[model samples]
Target: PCITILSGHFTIYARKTKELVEEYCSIHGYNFYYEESEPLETEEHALHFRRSWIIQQAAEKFPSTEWFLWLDSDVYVNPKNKNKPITSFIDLSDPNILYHTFHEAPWGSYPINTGVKFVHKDALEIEKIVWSLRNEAPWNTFPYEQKTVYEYVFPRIPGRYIVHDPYTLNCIVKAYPEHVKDALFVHMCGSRAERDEHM
Candidate 1:
């Protein structure tokens, strides 16, 4: 069983993302994969829904893989971590673990950032929940995927997943200035213009 990185991004994002992911995957010997799809709804909702689909499909496609990590296109591994294995983030004792990075939202706390996830192959039940979350009105009612997750999903499944520290998978650079250097990777959030500045 090997660790695999999964993602799906629109072609319009900053070009360096692909190169960075490729370099990191090659350096660490992890399987890298991508999915291509046009937004079926709003960018945020469609993209989030597609990510859950990607993970569900990836688990089926790569049955022998032990762990599957989902990284958004806006993400980039720190230069120093290119060669580091992501397996350290996994808790092997828990076979049905699903780890997701998160931050506090206005409504309350939640695993808002779907940018990065650590999903074990045996976490099929959680995957089903993700798929249901995608199909339900959560996306349309809340609009923002993060908000949808917080409102609809998180409450239903309490301990099924772990809320990863925001620093390890920093969502937006400016928000966590003090922990910037310590972050394993940074997600250049916002529009292409804003992300360009972060990059």
Candidate 2:
């Protein structure tokens, strides 16, 4: 599991996050991997500036795991989720790639949510693909890093190379409204503070 947070001025909070991970794993029985806090590298260049953290992480760790599973920290899993283990969803039969959430909405066909992407290390040409896409994408003032994966990689990679059915992996519980309890993961962006306050 991975969490991407902007540290900004929250030094103690960031530092304490490591302890939090250790405690979480202790209770959960799953080892928690706490990646180092990404630093603002230079006057003009940040290290994760061009979607490098994820790309770099995959490169570094891919040798160990055939599949790199990525999930945003903000996502919530149902209490029942751990027991059931929704392996059927994220486990795209293809060893090449997998993505959470359906591409189009309403859980129709293609995988839409890029928040969770499963990449088969052997199948990706990460550096070349990311660099090429970064050079090609149209520039908005504040372009999102994800566009590099969605608009570029997924589109360019052969269907066989990319996995399908994102909705099955990552879903908005509220999206169904009726089936709210069925969600495997709900992306609660920036809701951590709110949740803690309420708790």
Candidate 3:
């Protein structure tokens, strides 16, 4: 099954991270896609939820792709881990898995991190999540899309999604001192100043 690495962002500071992911895709034989304009904003309800649009559109555009690896604009594939293809995190042969994400939020803190994800071709269930985000979720919620997916999708499609161990996200790599092993992808999620410096 072929894989495509996808992301959507402002097309500004994401240059570094985006370029790296592009290179990683080239090296691993995966197609890379980046979109500039967001799809779901009507002047009132616009959150990062448009990420679901990017994924949905990309899947349609690349019908041959079996795996869609969605990476956040802030998410960068570390040089050391670039060689590890999309297969490094999940069992591709496992017929039961339709999505792959990491639990960076422990359980009480948050749901799975949608910052990085692997959505399978057969995962039509994504439509259910997107539908809820557009109609049922409060766009004002902090991290609105993640919250909606957590509340709507996980419970509905409990058996198909897989949250991996040794979560790769750098988002609270520590509450101050909780985590490193080489991260497959490192997310510089905190401050604008700090992220620019490190990125």
Candidate 4:
């Protein structure tokens, strides 16, 4: 059995979402769980940065697994969508690489559904590197976790794999015009606010 972990606040909605993943994934054969920790900041304005911190926390706890799956609270499960293997997109044999692709967005070229990513636990070193850089605490700053991944890891790792389509993980910002025909994830990132509202 594989695992997917999420970090959320100790609020009512947090508990609600915890049960949501538990019940939903249980029915679909995914061993899903949530970590009951408050986000770094839970304001409407800091959604992006907060999410980055959540990923950082999750990686710290669930370190060094074959894969670490990150999913947002708004994500829904499709039981019938099982049996699609993600090995085609990720190179599990490698230890140092954080494997994921991208999806198109309406506003601009940000990361796809970062909510759903399969990171190899061995890639935690990169996670640590990125997490630390987010806290330089300077007067001017670079915000959001994706920036570190884009600016730091991807550039350093030669032949870093970046898939730009929704297989099982769909970006709610912008839906693809055509179907992948054999997608394992589908990100539903349509608009900016729609994606932010989930955070």
Candidate 5:
């Protein structure tokens, strides 16, 4: 019950994701909530940076939350992870890690896949990052918010005030480690039809 799960979509295209996530959250005793504020209906790049606004609103909304885990509306959970809390993907002892995320390996193409992000409790820093992105980012850009973070959140090496660690699997899947073998998260990064087909 410590971590509060967060996610959202501009429309019903990802409606089914709610059930899959909430059910997973239920078995793990985590709260699943939505962040619906921040205007983005016509920024042309609205969807690209919607997570920035949603992340800002949610941290402020849940003043005393532990961790805010962000997942794309298309991510699915396997029964293997049915009992593991979001903590299974995170290491709480390392207080320096501000967030946890997955990377699409094989090098190239937007490296960091923000479809899943584990936000730490030092949320004010994250809040600042969100607004900075809203203003500094141009109307159109490659990789959008993912690049914004990689820029603002520099020196993620170690002992940095703001940092993030990698995920066990890059969301594409392979031979996963035993620690995460039972906790498989299904993520489909594809076209609308493809996403629906996988659903």
Candidate 6:
């Protein structure tokens, strides 16, 4: 059996977030769990940066688990994906490749959507990725985790990142209408009211 991990305050988005993750885990036969979203010591670390940190914690805490799945609170899981296996998107033969959802920035470019991702627990590069998020100076200044990851980390490790398009993990769904059909999950990113309406 596989283990799934998620983290969020969920004070406002609790209902849909719970239903989405619970249903996904139930259909996939995964033992789902949540980590406390303890605030980072510094103010520079935005709420989104905490998501990356939580994923690192999950990877380290459950070292023996083969897969670590992270989903943001605003992501709504598609019912069509209920029967799909998490491993189906991964190439288990290669220990180096890690998975993340990607989408083009407004200017049209590749930026990783860290809101939903799959981290291979055994990947040595994961340590570096997590460290870069934690220690890299730019991460604190840039504000957006995706930009820091794309510009700094991804270049260091070329083919190691298996970039799944937004269709597989819908991000910025409100901004882009074309990807709506193929989205396995939709990230309702914006004000609490906007997200609630989408739910």
Say which candidate scores most in lDDT. Answer: 3
Which tens-of-lDDT digit does each residue in 48-156 have in candidate 3?
A: 6676777777877787988888888887887777788756745777777787777765432565777777778887457546644664536446666667666766677
What digit string (tens of lDDT, one per residue) describes model 1 on residues 44-149? 5555666667777777676777878888888888776666666554344665444554663433334467666666776656666665665466454444445555
lDDT of 6: 0.63
Deviation in Å, model 4, residue 75 alpha carbon: 2.5
Could you give the candidate ranking by lDDT, starting with the highest? 3, 1, 6, 5, 4, 2
Clashing pairs in 6: none
Model 4: per-residue lDDT, tens digit, 45-76? 34544544555566556554455666665543
Q: Which stretches of candidate 2 lie over 4 Å from their true place?
A: 1-32, 41-52, 58-62, 96-101, 104-111, 131-143, 161-168, 189-192, 195-199
Model 1 worst lDDT window (10 residues): 102-111
Candidate 2 worst ten-residue window by lDDT: 1-10
Model 4 residue 48 lDDT score? 48
* TM-score for candidate 3: 0.83
**TM-score, every prediction:** 0.78, 0.61, 0.83, 0.64, 0.78, 0.77
Q: Candidate 4 local accuracy as lDDT?
A: 0.52
Q: What RMSD does each model have against the real structure?
A: 3.3, 6.0, 3.0, 5.0, 3.9, 3.2
The candidate with the higher TM-score, 1 or 4, is: 1
Off by over 4 Å in 5: 11-13, 36-39, 135-140, 156-158, 161-170, 173-183
Most TM-score-accurate candidate: 3
lDDT agreement with native, every candidate: 0.65, 0.43, 0.69, 0.52, 0.62, 0.63
Better of 3 and 6 by TM-score: 3
Candidate 6, residue 187: how far the Cα is off, in Å: 0.9
lDDT of 6 by residue, 1-199 (tens): 3565565652556577767777888887775656554675445556656666666666666666666777777776766665676666444466666555455466234456666766666543554465456546666655456666667657777887776666556546766667665557667664778777677
Q: In candidate 1, which residue pairs clash?
A: none
